[PDB]
Amino acid sequence: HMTEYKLVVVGAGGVGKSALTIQLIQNHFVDEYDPTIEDSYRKQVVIDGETCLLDILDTAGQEEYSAMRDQYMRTGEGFLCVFAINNTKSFEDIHHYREQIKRVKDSEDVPMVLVGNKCDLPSRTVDTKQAQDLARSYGIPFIETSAKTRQGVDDAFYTLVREIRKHK
Amino acid sequence: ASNSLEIEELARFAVDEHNKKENALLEFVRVVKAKEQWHFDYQQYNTMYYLTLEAKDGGKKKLYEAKVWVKRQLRMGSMNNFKELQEFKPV
Ligand SMILES: Nc1nc2c(ncn2[C@@H]2O[C@H](COP(=O)(O)OP(=O)(O)O)[C@@H](O)[C@H]2O)c(=O)[nH]1
Ligand SMILES: [Mg+2]
């Protein structure tokens, strides 16, 4: 009797899309997952009493041809847009990831969470305020995560599911 | 997953919080009715729970209405969780 939620993880190479996704699926930090590999996962999880099946695509890029990525981008219900708090370029790229989602969904109001990953690091270049301001301007929630420590991982995915519910 | 709570967990919380506030010894049996009303705002995923539950009071099964308020709020990149028993009264 599971409610299916189709989720897509997007963001620049190296931000931690694979590490975040694998923390949710396998409950440990996998710190060297091939940066070119895309894979989907089916996670059975109870969220707020709802038995959910999260159908999650971990994307590896948006340029190389992928029938599977195109299908998930077109029919995906919610998107994690991930940058790294020590990588200003990854944060500047967020605009382009959001624009692609709005274009393929033909909607201004797509369920999304802005995720500032690697919040374990001392080497912050993107201030929490800077990220929160961008998210607020988009009308999307913002959370800081560490795939390394698993900080914020469950809350990022649960927040995306709650964003999809608001919109369904 | 600390802010992902089931109706039963919120009913046990209500009984435990009542027992603490009023120095009572109600023993939770089961939930009879539940209404959950979600309240959404920017970075707010809040819920009012209207619970009818059965608890043993001095060896006698009685019905109670409880209201539990749950706040799940993102502030400066961090999830903030809050739960409070708002009301607990016999039916
Ligand atoms: N310090 C730190 N490093 C991370 C974190 N998440 C991922 N990494 C590292 O960042 C690099 C890229 O992670 P990966 O998950 O492959 O990124 P992807 O290209 O977005 O899939 C790897 O060296 C990971 O070990 C994190 O939360 N903290
Ligand atoms: Mg990857």
Residue numbers in the entry:
A (entry chain A): 0 to 167
B (entry chain C): 2 to 92
What do the study authors state?
The RAS family of small GTPases consists of four members, KRAS4A, KRAS4B, HRAS, and NRAS, which act as bi-directional molecular switches that cycle between an inactive GDP-bound form, and an active GTP-bound form. RAS mutations are the most common oncogenic drivers across human cancers, but there remains a paucity of clinically-validated pharmacological inhibitors of RAS, as druggable pockets have proven difficult to identify. Here, we identify two RAS-binding Affimer proteins, K3 and K6, that inhibit nucleotide exchange and downstream signaling pathways with distinct isoform and mutant profiles. Here, we demonstrate the use of Affimer proteins, a scaffold-based biologic, to identify and directly probe two druggable pockets on wild-type KRAS associated with inhibition of nucleotide exchange and effector molecule binding.
Three of the Affimers, K3, K6, and K37, showed clear inhibition of this process, the remaining four Affimers that bound to KRAS showed partial (Affimers K19 and K68) or no inhibition (Affimers K69 and K91) of nucleotide exchange. The latter four Affimers are not discussed further, besides K69 which was used as a control in the Nano-BRET assays.
